[PDB]
C-alpha cells in the first residue's frame, strides 16, 4: 500500500509530508467503513523501536 502521512520535521515549529510503502499485515484501519485511513498494527499496544 502506498501510504502518505504527516510527520514532524527537525524544526519543532514545522512539519513534513512524506510517503512510504507498508504491507497490509502491518496496517490496521481506524474503522471498517471509512476506508483509505489506516494506522500501524502496534500503536494501541506500545511504540515500536527502529532497529
Amino acid at each position: 500500500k502506498n501510504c502518505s502521512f504527516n510527520m514532524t520535521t527537525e524544526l519543532r515549529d514545522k512539519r513534513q509530508k512524506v510517503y512510504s510503502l507498508f504491507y497490509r499485515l502491518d496496517i490496521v484501519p481506524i474503522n471498517e467503513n471509512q476506508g483509505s485511513e489506516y494506522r500501524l498494527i502496534n500503536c494501541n499496544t506500545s511504540a515500536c523501536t527502529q532497529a
Partner: antibody
Amino acid sequence: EVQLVESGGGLAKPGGSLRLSCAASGFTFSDYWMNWVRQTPGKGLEWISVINSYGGSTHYADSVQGRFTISRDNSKNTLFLQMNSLRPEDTAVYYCAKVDADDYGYFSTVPGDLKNYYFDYWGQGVLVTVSS
Amino acid sequence: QIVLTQSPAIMSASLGEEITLTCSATSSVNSIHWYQQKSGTAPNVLIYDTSNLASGVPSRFSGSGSGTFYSLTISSVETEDAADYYCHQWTTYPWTFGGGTKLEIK
C-alpha cells in the same frame, strides 16, 4: 504527458454569478496544487487565487478577496472556481495551471508550503466576461 | 508586500541580435522564473530557479542574477522569439508576476 483542460468560462451577468471548471489527468491531482491566473486583453498576467492540497487553505489576492472562491474535488479530479459579483473590469483570459512539483516535503502550516513552485503545465485560454 | 518591475517595457531586435532583459523587485527573493506567452496561447516556462533552463526550450535563452536584481539574456533572436515575456517570484506574498516586456522583430 500531462493533459489538462478547462471550461465553464464565457458570457455572464455583471454582478451576478458564474462557476468555472478545470479537469486534469495523467498525474496524481490529489498531490499537486492548483492556481488560477488571469490575463486581461492587451496587458500582462495577473494572479488571483491558489488552492492547497486536501483543500487546506484558499489564499486569494486583495482585488478578489471575498468575491471569488476556489474549491476542488480530488475524488473526481475536477477543479472548479466560483465567481461571484464579477464586474466588467474583471474581464481577462483566465488560465488553469499546475505547479512544478508535488507538496511532499517540508512545510510550516499547509502541506505544500515552502516549496519552489513554477507553472510548468497550462491549459487552454478561456475568456470570461460579462455583457448585456 | 513585494512588487516586481521589468525593464525595458518594449524592445525591438533583429535576426541574430544580442539583447538583454532584466527584472527587479523591491525585496530579495530566492529565485525568479522567466516566462513567454503568445496571443491566444498558454504561457510556457523557459528558465526556472534563475539558472536551470526548462526541458525542450532552445539554448539561446539564458539568465542569471542574485539579490533584488535579475536578468534574461537572449544570445540569438529569431522570428519566433517576438513575444511577451515575464518574471515570477515565489518567496513571499502575493506571488505576483512582472510588468511584462514586449519583443518585436526590428
